[PDB]
Symmetry: C3
Subunit: 160 residues, 3 copies
């Protein structure tokens, strides 16, 4: 019901999709560490979205900070650097890992929408950072999906 409650739950659903990718996609050590850090960040995003903003909090805030987003942006550029240009649009799938990352990607985008909806409902009580974080995360998951498809992505083909 509550816009904050919905956004929080969607973050949890996106987080579980990353857990499935890690558990069923068998990523290498490097990718594993990146994904595990993201699971930790998504918990933070959920806590942030669920907690209304208060003036001069006396408790340690658990909020997504700009540095979280700067970090995803850095990983995006670092990982995308070693990839060839796309010849056609990518269809979701390929290796078990790429397929599972595409699933997480789409769930993350659904979570981004509710995070923005939370902001719309409480412009003064909800931070826009969780939404921006999820916005950058889906782009990173797209890149990682490509990284996880060594032999090329599944491509769309014009009807005729």
């Amino acid at each position: 019901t509550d816009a904050r409650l919905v956004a929080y739950a969607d973050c949890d659903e996106a987080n579980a999709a990353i857990g499935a990718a890690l558990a069923l996609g068998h990523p290498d050590t490097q990718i594993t560490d990146v994904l595990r850090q993201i699971q930790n960040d998504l918990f933070d995003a959920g806590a942030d979205l669920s907690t209304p903003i208060v003036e001069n909090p006396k408790h340690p805030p658990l909020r997504i900070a700009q540095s979280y987003i700067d970090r995803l942006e850095g990983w995006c550029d670092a990982y995308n650097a070693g990839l060839p240009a796309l010849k056609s649009f990518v269809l979701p799938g390929g290796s078990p890992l790429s397929a599972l990352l595409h699933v997480a990607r789409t769930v993350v985008r659904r979570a981004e929408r509710s995070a923005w909806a939370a902001v719309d409902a409480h412009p003064e009580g909800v931070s826009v950072l969780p939404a921006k974080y999820l916005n950058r995360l889906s782009d990173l998951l797209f890149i990682l999906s490509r990284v996880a498809n060594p032999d090329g992505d599944v491509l769309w083909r014009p009807g005729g």
Copy 2:
């Protein structure tokens, strides 16, 4: 936010669920080709839903056409022909492939709802064909799930 944006995103989520079925369900060659064609059609459905209808477009339209739907309807009848009558209601699951197709099936039905919602919000700017396509696709995925369960489906049992 936008009804078109939501419908588009749900199609992408359904498309990723089909990608997982293909990647983790190890379907045979025949089923693979059918599912790959559907992934291509779902991209088209997304492009259609996201693009508002314009009079006398000067660009090649990327729209779901009736022929897409006629094709799914044909596959439905062709595949359902070799199946026995249901003794009870089917519970989602069984083989890895059938279970993964049931997951995609339910996501497709969620996408169908937003496609219809897009039509409701813009009766003159959104085509009903994407929604009809998704409507027929969930029925086909139900049939394929049965096809992928050679030893029988998981059946519901009256409480007592």
Copy 3:
């Protein structure tokens, strides 16, 4: 569109997520029987949510009864009894089975929200029992996820 239709469909999506857990998580005999019973209950929950309540029905009702909920509550206590105290918050994932149960858990919570929304839209024509059932089911799936992670859960870690 219809609040009952949406709630019904979400129950079906949650049911398919349990089917994936069973099909890809390879649970032992005990867990299998519990999950299979839940799939049967979720069918009932869907039928209940989809069928508006009528006075003096002449047909056998297919409704979630309090006994369904009492049963989940009993399993929750029985399974949680053999588990150690949590040292930190749990991140969704771990073993294939635990990861798949966390995915189902989050879908069940999404279904709970629409079941409550159905009640809100038709306070006199929709039972609150399906919603209560889903409320208890996500807590049980959390417990089972822990049970399925013999070597410990994936834990959240404070930023610094």
